[PDB]
Amino acid sequence: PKTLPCDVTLDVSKNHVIVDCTDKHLTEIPGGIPTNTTNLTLTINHIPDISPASFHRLVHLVEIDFRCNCVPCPRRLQIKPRSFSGLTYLKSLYLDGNQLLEIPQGLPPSLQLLSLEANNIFSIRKEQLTELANIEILYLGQNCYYRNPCYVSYSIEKDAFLNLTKLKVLSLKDNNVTTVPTVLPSTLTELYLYNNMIAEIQEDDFNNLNQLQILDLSGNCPRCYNAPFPCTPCKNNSPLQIPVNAFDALTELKVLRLHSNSLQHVPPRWFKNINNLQELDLSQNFLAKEIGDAKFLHFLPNLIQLDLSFNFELQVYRASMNLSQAFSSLKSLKILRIRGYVFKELKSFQLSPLHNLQNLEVLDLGTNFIKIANLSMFKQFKRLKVIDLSVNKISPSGDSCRFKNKEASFTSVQESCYKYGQTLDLSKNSIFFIKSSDFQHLSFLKCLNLSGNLISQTLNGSEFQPLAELRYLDFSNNRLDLLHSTAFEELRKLEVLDISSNSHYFQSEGITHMLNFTKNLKVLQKLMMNDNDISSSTSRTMESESLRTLEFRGNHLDVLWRDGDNRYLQLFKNLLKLEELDISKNSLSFLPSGVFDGMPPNLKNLSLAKNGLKSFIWEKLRYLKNLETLDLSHNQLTTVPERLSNCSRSLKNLILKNNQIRSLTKYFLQDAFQLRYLDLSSNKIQMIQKTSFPENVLNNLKMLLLHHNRFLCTCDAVWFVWWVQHTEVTIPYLATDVTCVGPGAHKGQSVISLD
Amino acid sequence: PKTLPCDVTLDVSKNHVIVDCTDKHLTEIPGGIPTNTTNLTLTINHIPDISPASFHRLVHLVEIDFRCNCVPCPRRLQIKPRSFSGLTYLKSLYLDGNQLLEIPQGLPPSLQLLSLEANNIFSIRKEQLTELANIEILYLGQNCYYRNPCYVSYSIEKDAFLNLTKLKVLSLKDNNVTTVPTVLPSTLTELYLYNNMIAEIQEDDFNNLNQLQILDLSGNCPRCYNAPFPCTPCKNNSPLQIPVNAFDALTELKVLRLHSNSLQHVPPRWFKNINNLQELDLSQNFLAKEIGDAKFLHFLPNLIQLDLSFNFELQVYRASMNLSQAFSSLKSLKILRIRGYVFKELKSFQLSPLHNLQNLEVLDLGTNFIKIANLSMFKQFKRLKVIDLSVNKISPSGDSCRFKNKEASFTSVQESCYKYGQTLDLSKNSIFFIKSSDFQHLSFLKCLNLSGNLISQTLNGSEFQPLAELRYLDFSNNRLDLLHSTAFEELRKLEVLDISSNSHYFQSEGITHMLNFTKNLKVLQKLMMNDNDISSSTSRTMESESLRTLEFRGNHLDVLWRDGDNRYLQLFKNLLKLEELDISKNSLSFLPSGVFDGMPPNLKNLSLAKNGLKSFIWEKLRYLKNLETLDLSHNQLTTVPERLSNCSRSLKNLILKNNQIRSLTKYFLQDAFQLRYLDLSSNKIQMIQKTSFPENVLNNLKMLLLHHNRFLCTCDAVWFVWWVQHTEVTIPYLATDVTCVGPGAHKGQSVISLD
Numbered sequence A, B: 001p002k003t004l005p006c007d008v009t010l011d012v013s014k015n016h017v018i019v020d021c022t023d024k025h026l027t028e029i030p031g032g033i034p035t036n037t038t039n040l041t042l043t044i045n046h047i048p049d050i051s052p053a054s055f056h057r058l059v060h061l062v063e064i065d066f067r068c069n070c071v072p073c074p075r076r077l078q079i080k081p082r083s084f085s086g087l088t089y090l091k092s093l094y095l096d097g098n099q100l101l102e103i104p105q106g107l108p109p110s111l112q113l114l115s116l117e118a119n120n121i122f123s124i125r126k127e128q129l130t131e132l133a134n135i136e137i138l139y140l141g142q143n144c145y146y147r148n149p150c151y152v153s154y155s156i157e158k159d160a161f162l163n164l165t166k167l168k169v170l171s172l173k174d175n176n177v178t179t180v181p182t183v184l185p186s187t188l189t190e191l192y193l194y195n196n197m198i199a200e201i202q203e204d205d206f207n208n209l210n211q212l213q214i215l216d217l218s219g220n221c222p223r224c225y226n227a228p229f230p231c232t233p234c235k236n237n238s239p240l241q242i243p244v245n246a247f248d249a250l251t252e253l254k255v256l257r258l259h260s261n262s263l264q265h266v267p268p269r270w271f272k273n274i275n276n277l278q279e280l281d282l283s284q285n286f287l288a289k290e291i292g293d294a295k296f297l298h299f300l301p302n303l304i305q306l307d308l309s310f311n312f313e314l315q316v317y318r319a320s321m322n323l324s325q326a327f328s329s330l331k332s333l334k335i336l337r338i339r340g341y342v343f344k345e346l347k348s349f350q351l352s353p354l355h356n357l358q359n360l361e362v363l364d365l366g367t368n369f370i371k372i373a374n375l376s377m378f379k380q381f382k383r384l385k386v387i388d389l390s391v392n393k394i395s396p397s398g399d400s401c402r403f404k405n406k407e408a409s410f411t412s413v414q415e416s417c418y419k420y421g422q423t424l425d426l427s428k429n430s431i432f433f434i435k436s437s438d439f440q441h442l443s444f445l446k447c448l449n450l451s452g453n454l455i456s457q458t459l460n461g462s463e464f465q466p467l468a469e470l471r472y473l474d475f476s477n478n479r480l481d482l483l484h485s486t487a488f489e490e491l492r493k494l495e496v497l498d499i500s501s502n503s504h505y506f507q508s509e510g511i512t513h514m515l516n517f518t519k520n521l522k523v524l525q526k527l528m529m530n531d532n533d534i535s536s537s538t539s540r541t542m543e544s545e546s547l548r549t550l551e552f553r554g555n556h557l558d559v560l561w562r563d564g565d566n567r568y569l570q571l572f573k574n575l576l577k578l579e580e581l582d583i584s585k586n587s588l589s590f591l592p593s594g595v596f597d598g599m600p601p602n603l604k605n606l607s608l609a610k611n612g613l614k615s616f617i618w619e620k621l622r623y624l625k626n627l628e629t630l631d632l633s634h635n636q637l638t639t640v641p642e643r644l645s646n647c648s649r650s651l652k653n654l655i656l657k658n659n660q661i662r663s664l665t666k667y668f669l670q671d672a673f674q675l676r677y678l679d680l681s682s683n684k685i686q687m688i689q690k691t692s693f694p695e696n697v698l699n700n701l702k703m704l705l706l707h708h709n710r711f712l713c714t715c716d717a718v719w720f721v722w723w724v725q726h727t728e729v730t731i732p733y734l735a736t737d738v739t740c741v742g743p744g745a746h747k748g749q750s751v752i753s754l755d
C-alpha cells in the first residue's frame, strides 16, 4: 500500500487479502485500493451513497461489508443501478444498518450470502428474489420491531422462497411476521422465525422440510411478566397453538428452540418423528406442571441439551422441586438447566431420576431461592463437571452493529475454575459461616466459588478439612480476618487462592494481618488478593516456595513503603519462585530506594499501571536481571532513562501508555538490541532525533505505537517523516490517530501522508 | 464587637454571652475580646501555648473550651503557672486533645467540670487532685488505648478520689485501667470505667457507693470474635469475675451496662438489692444458654430497657429462638433487643412470654437470619409500636474532637415512619414477591418499610389488600414495574409513598410508564420517587387532588422536556394542591419555554440544584404567583435578572450557591421589599454598586451570604467597604471565608478589616 489507512492482511496459502477499515470515519472510499483484495471492510462511516465506479477496477473482491453505515445520521443510503454486476467473483455481501426500503437489484449471480438486517424492508416479492436464485444464506431479520418500528405487518407473497433451491439458512427475527412464508424450500437447513408475532402454526407449514436441522420459534406469545423489554402478550394469554402432527416431516432436526412461548403442555406427539433431536429449549414458559409429568421426555433418547429455565408460576412458592421419573430416559443428556424453578427446600430424593445419567456433566440449579439444601447429597454426582449453587439463598445447616457470525448459539461463560475439574459454584449464597461438617463427603471437589457470600469468619486452618483434593478456592467479596497465619493450612493440594474484595477487615488499623500464611501452602501457584486496600501487615515478609503469580492491585502500598519505614522494603524478597507482579493502582507517588533490591530474583512481569509515579528511577533496574515486561502505563513519569541498555539488559516489553513525556534522550535506544516491544502513545512528545532511534534497533522491533500524541510536523523532523513512510515497523493507527499539531495549516495532517 | 472573627450570641435572660471560634485557624487569641463574655470557644487551631495574660482582663468567663488543640501537629501544649487563678467565676473547663503529661495546676476553686480526654496522663496522685476538692464532673478517659497508646498501665494511688466529696461524675474509659481506684467517694452518681482492662472485681469495690445511678463495665474481657477494632482477649476466654455480693450497697442504681464482657452466667444475686434498675445492657456476651433460663429476670420488676444483642455461639446455628418463661416478669419492659441471636425459624409460641407485656413498645429482632417467620403471628402485638424485621432473610411463606455532652446514652435512629404509628420495618429482607395472604391479620399496621428487598413485581391494586389502615409505605431499592395505573389503589388511607431507587424498570425505553397512578390515592400527601432515572412516561399528565410534596431528583427530565416535544410540558399542571417541588440533578441544560406556564398554581418550594442550567430565563417567573423558595444552587447561570421585582412579586428565598456570576445588574434589588433570603456565595463576583444594593431592602434581609468568592478589594468599592463594617446584616464568615483577590499585597485581606 501507499496511503491506505486500513490494515492489510495477506494469506498466501488461502490466496485471500483482508482490508479492515473499521471505525475510520471515512466520508468516501479512499483511493489506491489494490485490485487483488478479497475481503473489504466498510463498516460505520459517513458514506453518503454507493457508486458503480467504487468497484469498477475491483474484480477479485469476494466479500463486501456495509454493516451499520447509517444508524437511525443523514438520509438513507441510495444504491445506483448495476453497482454490483461487475463483481463476478463476489460470494458474500453484507448490507446491515443501511435503512434500505427495497431489496437492491443487479446483484451478481455468484452471490451466496446476503444480509439485510436493521433495514426498512417490510415487503417480500418474488420479482426481487428472482435474481437471488443462487443465494445460500439470507438474513432479513430485525426489519420491524420495538427498536426499529415500521407500523406495517410483514407481508410475503405466496411461494416467494420456493424458487430459491440453493437456500440453506433463512432468518426473519424481529420482523413482525404473523404467518410463516409458505412454502419454504425443501433444501432449507436452518430456520430462524423467532421473536415474531406468529399466533398459529399450520399442519402443512413444515410439510416439505426434510433437511431442516435448526428451528427457532421464540417470541411467539411470549411471557411478558417482569419483562425488561417491550412486548405484546397474546389474547387471553393463549399459548402458541402448535398441532400434534406438526414436526412429522422433520427427520434431521437437531436443535429446537421454544423459549418464551408461554406453553402449558408438551404433547409427546411433537417428538414422535424427530428421534435425532440434540438441543431442546423450553425456557420462559408455564411448564411448571409439565415438569412434574414430563411425558414427552420418553421420546428423546439422543437429547444433549435441555433447557427449562424460568418456568415459575405467578404468586406460587413451591415447597420443593417436583422432578418427574421420566428424566432417567435422557441417557445422552449432558447439560440440564432448571433455573427459575423457585422452591423452598431441596432434598436428595428429588434428584433420584438424575442419578442414573452417566453422561450428565453440567447441572444448573441457580436462581431458585433454595433455603434448605444438604451439601452431602451431591456425593453421588462425582461424574458431574459443573454444579450450580448460584445466587439462591442456600444457608448452612442448623442444629448488533458489530459481530459477523449473526445467528450463533449462546456461548456458556467459561469460568477459570471449570478447567480444574469438579466445580461447586456457591457464589452469592446465604452462607455467613463455614463448618467442616457441611462440606463433608465432598473430597472430590476440585473447585469452590464463594464470591459475594459476605462471610465474616476468622479461619485458623480447620474449616475446609474435607476439601483435601481442592485446588482452586474463591473467597471474593467476603470479610476475611487474617488474624492467624495458619489459614488455609489444611488445603494441601490448593493451587490458586482468591481473597480479593476483602477490604472490610484490611481497612482497619492496629489489628494483626498475617501476610505470611502462604508458607504453609506448598503447591500454591497463583494468589489473587487485589482490591483489598491493605495498609498494614504484622508479618514483615511473605514466604512462599512455589508462588509464581501474585496480584496486589488496588491496595495501599504507599503507607507500607513510607519514607523512613524500611520494615516492609523486602516484602517480596522471600518469594523465590515469583515471576509476575501486579502492584498497580496503589497511589504510589514515588518509589523509595531499596525496593528493587528486595524484589524477587526471578521477577519477570512487573506492572505499575495507574500508580501516579511522580519520579521513577531507572538506574536501580540493574538489580532485576530477569525483568522483561515492565509496565508503567497511566503514570506521571516525566524523564526517560539516559541509556536503557545500561539500565536493564533483558527488558523487551517496556510500556509507557497514557504518560506525560515531552522529549526523549539522545541515546534512549542505544545498543538496546534486546528490546522487542515499545509503547509511547498518548504522550506529549515533540520530536525524535536520529541518534535516539537507530535503524538497527528498530529493525527487530515487533510492534511500536506512537499514536494519539502531540507530535509536531515541522521542518526539524524530516528524518522522522522519511522514516515513517519508508519502514516496515508495524505502527497501528499510523494515519488515523496520530496527527500533526502544527504549524498553522498542518493541523490534523497525517504523518505518513506528508511530503 | 469591632474585628472579632467569631460569632457572638447574647442571652439577656440568662446573662450569658457565647463566643464561638470553631474552625478558624487562629494561631493566637485575637484581641478586642469583651470582658462580659461567659462561654469561650477555643477549639482546633494553631495555638502554641497558653499564657496567663490571655485571660488577664477576663474575669466574667465561666466556660473555657480547649478541645483538640493539637491532634497527634507541633509539640504538646504548655500551660504557664497561675494561668487560671484569675478566673474566679470559672465553673467549667475543657482541655481535651492537648497531649498533656500531668494535670494542670493553679485551677480556681470555683471549677466544677474538668475534661482531660485524649491526653497522656497515666498517673493519678492526690497532690494534683487536692486543688480539685470542689470539682463535680471529671473526665480523664481515653488516655491510653489503641488509638493513643502509652505502653504504661494506669496507676492510681490509694484514696486518690476519697477527698473529692463534691465529685458526682467520673469517667476513666479507654485508660488501660486494671484495678478500680478504691475507694471512690460515696457521693458519686455516675461511674464510667468501661473499655478498660479490669479482670477481677472485689467485694468491697462498691461498698461505700450508695447514691450511684449509672455504672459502666464494658470492655472488660471483651468478645474479640469478628472485632473490627483492636482488642486483647482475656486468658482462656475467662469472663469478668464479678462476685455475687457485689451490687449489694447499690440501691439507687438505674442504668447498668455489661456490654462486651464475655459473660456466661448471670446469677440472680447480682440484682437482689438493686430493685430500681431501669436499663440493663448485656450485649456481645455468651449468654445464649442464659437466655433459655433467664432466672435473673425475676428480680427486675422495674426494668425499662433490656439489651441482649449479639449473643450468638460460635459455629452454632440454632433451629429456633429459645425464650424463657421468666420474661413475663418484666412488667415495665418497654424496649427489648434480641439481635444477633441467629436462628432458623421463628414461631408464634416462641413469643408467648412477651404476650403479657402491656408496656412493651419496641421489639428488636433484626440481624438474626430468620428463614421462616409467619407474619400473622404479630396480630397479638397490637400495642407494640416498632417491630424489627431487619436484614434477616425472612421470605414469603410457601405452599471525639467535636460534641460536648461526652458521656451520653445512645440515641435510637428516629425514622420518619415511626411517628405514624405501628411500624413493621421489613427492609433488606429476602422477600421477592408480595401476596395478600401473607399480610393477613395486619390491618393495624400504620407503617411498612421494604427498602432493599429487591422485589420485582407488577402491582395492579390487590397486593396490599389487608393494609386498609396503612398510611406510610416504603418501596425503595426495589424493581417496580409501573405497567398499570391501578397500583396502590386499595391503599385508601395511604399518605406517603416512597418508590425511590427503582431505576431498573424505568431505565428501559418503550415500555408503559403509568405516572398517573396517584389519581386513585385520595389522601396522598407526599410522594418520593427520586433517583429513578425516569426518561419516558406513557401518561401525559399526573393527577392528584391532595399531593403537596413531590420529589423528582436524580431523573432524566431533559428527554421529557426536549426541544420540539411539548407533550410533557404541563406534567405537573394537574397537581392543584402541590406546594413543594424537588426536580434536581436532572441534567437540564436549559429550560424550554412553557414549562413555567404548566407549573402548579400553588407551587411554593421549587428547587433546581445541580441541574447545570446554562441559561435560565427570569421573565417567565411572573406565572408563579406563589413562588417563595426558588433554589438555583450548584448551577451554571451567568446572567442575573434585570429587575427581580418585575420577575416575581413573592420570591423571598432566592439561592444561587456555587454559581458562576461575575457581575450584577444596576437594579438587581430595586423595589424588592418582599425579599427575605439572598445567597450569592461561591461565585465569581467582582464588585457591587450602590444602586444595586439599596439600604432599604437590605434592612429587612434576615440573612445574606457573600463568602468564598472572588471579590476584589480596590478603590472602586469604597461604598461596599464602608457598608460591610457599618451594617447589621447577618453575614456569616465575614472575616474567615471571604477575602480580597488583590491588588498586589491585598491578597487574603479581610473585607471587614479594611480601612
Ligand SMILES: *[C@@H]1O[C@H](CO)[C@@H](O[C@@H]2O[C@H](CO)[C@@H](O[C@@H]3O[C@H](CO)[C@@H](O)[C@H](O)[C@@H]3O)[C@H](O)[C@H]2NC(C)=O)[C@H](O)[C@H]1NC(C)=O
Pocket: A413, A415, A416, A417, A418, A425, A427, A428, A449, A450, A451, A452, A474
Ligand atoms: C465466582 O462467581 C462470581 C459470581 O458469578 C464470578 O464473578 C463474575 O465473573 C464474571 C465473569 O468474569 C463477570 O462477568 C464479567 O463482568 C464484567 C462486567 O461486570 C466484564 O468483564 C464482562 O462483561 C462480564 O460481564 C461478573 O461480573 C462477575 N461478577 C461479580 C459480582 O463480580 C466469579 O468469576 C466466579 N469465580 C470463579 C473462579 O469462577
Ligand SMILES: *[C@@H]1O[C@H](CO)[C@@H](O[C@@H]2O[C@H](CO)[C@@H](O[C@@H]3O[C@H](CO)[C@@H](O)[C@H](O)[C@@H]3O)[C@H](O)[C@H]2NC(C)=O)[C@H](O)[C@H]1NC(C)=O
Pocket: B413, B415, B416, B417, B418, B425, B427, B428, B449, B450, B451, B452, B474
Ligand atoms: C427503611 O429502612 C432502610 C434501611 O435501614 C432505611 O434506610 C436507611 O436510613 C438511614 C437513616 O436515614 C440511613 O442512615 C444514614 O445514611 C447516610 C449515610 O449512609 C447519612 O445520612 C447518615 O449518616 C445515616 O447513616 C441509611 O443509610 C439508610 N440505608 C440505606 C440502605 O439507604 C430507611 O430510612 C427506612 N425507611 C423508613 C421510612 O423508615
Ligand SMILES: *[C@@H]1O[C@H](CO)[C@@H](O[C@@H]2O[C@H](CO)[C@@H](O)[C@H](O)[C@H]2NC(C)=O)[C@H](O)[C@H]1NC(C)=O
Pocket: A016, A018, A038, A039, A062, A063, A091, A092
Ligand atoms: C473473507 O470472506 C470469505 C468469504 O468471501 C470468508 O470465507 C468464509 O469463511 C467462513 C468461516 O469464517 C466459512 O464458513 C465460509 O464458508 C467462507 N466462505 C467462503 C465463500 O469460502 C473469510 O472467512 C473472510 N475472511 C475474513 C478474515 O473475515
Ligand SMILES: *[C@@H]1O[C@H](CO)[C@@H](O[C@@H]2O[C@H](CO)[C@@H](O)[C@H](O)[C@H]2NC(C)=O)[C@H](O)[C@H]1NC(C)=O
Pocket: A144, A145, A146, A148, A149, A150, A151, A152, A153, A154, A176
Ligand atoms: C406489527 O404489525 C402490526 C400490524 O397490526 C402493528 O399494529 C398496528 O400498529 C399501528 C401503528 O401503531 C396501528 O395504527 C394499528 O392499529 C395496529 N394494528 C392493529 C391490528 O392493532 C404493530 O404496530 C407492528 N409492530 C411494530 C413494532 O412495528
Ligand SMILES: *[C@@H]1O[C@H](CO)[C@@H](O[C@@H]2O[C@H](CO)[C@@H](O)[C@H](O)[C@H]2NC(C)=O)[C@H](O)[C@H]1NC(C)=O
Pocket: A289, A291, A292, A293, A322
Ligand atoms: C408432581 O407433579 C405430578 C405431575 O403433575 C403430580 O402428580 C399429579 O398430582 C395431581 C394432584 O394430586 C393428580 O391429580 C394427578 O393425577 C397426578 N398425576 C400423575 C400422573 O400421577 C404430583 O402430585 C406432583 N408432586 C408434588 C409433590 O407436588
Ligand SMILES: *[C@@H]1O[C@H](CO)[C@@H](O[C@@H]2O[C@H](CO)[C@@H](O)[C@H](O)[C@H]2NC(C)=O)[C@H](O)[C@H]1NC(C)=O
Pocket: A485, A486, A514, A516, A517, A519, A520, A538, A539, A540
Ligand atoms: C508469620 O509471622 C508472624 C509474626 O509476624 C509469626 O508469629 C510469631 O510466631 C512466633 C513463633 O511461634 C512467636 O514466637 C511470635 O511471638 C509470633 N509473633 C507475633 C507478632 O505474633 C508467625 O509464626 C509467622 N507464621 C509462619 C507460618 O511462619
Ligand SMILES: *[C@@H]1O[C@H](CO)[C@@H](O[C@@H]2O[C@H](CO)[C@@H](O)[C@H](O)[C@H]2NC(C)=O)[C@H](O)[C@H]1NC(C)=O
Pocket: B016, B018, B038, B039, B062, B063, B091, B092
Ligand atoms: C455556657 O457554659 C455554661 C457553664 O459555664 C453552660 O451551662 C450548663 O448548661 C448545661 C446544659 O447545657 C447544664 O447541664 C449545666 O448545669 C450548666 N452549667 C452551669 C454551671 O450552669 C451553658 O450551657 C453554656 N452555653 C452554651 C451555649 O454552650
Ligand SMILES: *[C@@H]1O[C@H](CO)[C@@H](O[C@@H]2O[C@H](CO)[C@@H](O)[C@H](O)[C@H]2NC(C)=O)[C@H](O)[C@H]1NC(C)=O
Pocket: B144, B145, B146, B148, B149, B150, B151, B152, B153, B154, B176
Ligand atoms: C496497657 O498496659 C499494659 C501493661 O502491661 C501494656 O502491656 C505492656 O506493653 C508494653 C509495650 O508494648 C510491653 O513492653 C510490655 O511487655 C507489656 N506488658 C505486659 C505485662 O504484657 C499494654 O501495652 C498497654 N496497652 C496500651 C494500648 O497502651
Ligand SMILES: *[C@@H]1O[C@H](CO)[C@@H](O[C@@H]2O[C@H](CO)[C@@H](O)[C@H](O)[C@H]2NC(C)=O)[C@H](O)[C@H]1NC(C)=O
Pocket: B289, B291, B292, B293, B322
Ligand atoms: C432452652 O433453654 C433451657 C435452659 O437452658 C433448656 O432447658 C435445659 O435443657 C437441658 C438440655 O436438655 C437440660 O439439661 C436442663 O435441665 C434444662 N434446664 C431447665 C431449667 O429445664 C431448654 O432445653 C432449651 N430449649 C431448647 C428447645 O433448646
Ligand SMILES: *[C@@H]1O[C@H](CO)[C@@H](O[C@@H]2O[C@H](CO)[C@@H](O)[C@H](O)[C@H]2NC(C)=O)[C@H](O)[C@H]1NC(C)=O
Pocket: B485, B486, B514, B516, B517, B519, B520, B538, B539, B540
Ligand atoms: C392514565 O393514563 C393512561 C394513558 O396514558 C390511561 O389509559 C387509558 O385508559 C383509557 C380508559 O380506559 C383507555 O381508553 C386508553 O386506551 C388507555 N390508554 C393507554 C395508552 O393504555 C389510564 O386510564 C390513566 N389512568 C387513570 C387512573 O386515570
Ligand SMILES: *[C@@H]1O[C@H](CO)[C@@H](O)[C@H](O)[C@H]1NC(C)=O
Pocket: A374, A375, A376, A377, A397, A398
Ligand atoms: C446430610 O446428609 C448426610 C449424609 O446422609 C447426613 O449425615 C447429614 O445429617 C445430612 N444433613 C442434614 C442437615 O440433614
Ligand SMILES: *[C@@H]1O[C@H](CO)[C@@H](O)[C@H](O)[C@H]1NC(C)=O
Pocket: A460, A461, A462
Ligand atoms: C481452630 O478453631 C476451632 C474453632 O474454634 C478450634 O476447635 C480448633 O481447635 C482451632 N485449631 C487450632 C489449631 O487452634
Ligand SMILES: *[C@@H]1O[C@H](CO)[C@@H](O)[C@H](O)[C@H]1NC(C)=O
Pocket: A604, A605, A628, A629
Ligand atoms: C507478561 O505478561 C504479559 C501480559 O500481557 C504476557 O503477555 C507475557 O507473556 C508475560 N510474560 C511472561 C514471560 O510470562
Ligand SMILES: *[C@@H]1O[C@H](CO)[C@@H](O)[C@H](O)[C@H]1NC(C)=O
Pocket: B374, B375, B376, B377, B397, B398
Ligand atoms: C400463619 O398463621 C395464620 C394464623 O394462624 C394461619 O392461618 C396461617 O396458615 C399461618 N401460615 C403458615 C405459613 O403457617
Ligand SMILES: *[C@@H]1O[C@H](CO)[C@@H](O)[C@H](O)[C@H]1NC(C)=O
Pocket: B460, B461, B462
Ligand atoms: C390483579 O392481578 C391479580 C393477580 O394476577 C389478579 O388475580 C386480579 O384479578 C388482578 N386485578 C385486576 C383488577 O385486574
Ligand SMILES: *[C@@H]1O[C@H](CO)[C@@H](O)[C@H](O)[C@H]1NC(C)=O
Pocket: B604, B605, B628, B629
Ligand atoms: C421551603 O423549603 C425550605 C427548605 O429549607 C423550608 O425551610 C421552607 O420552610 C419551605 N417553605 C414553605 C413555604 O413550605
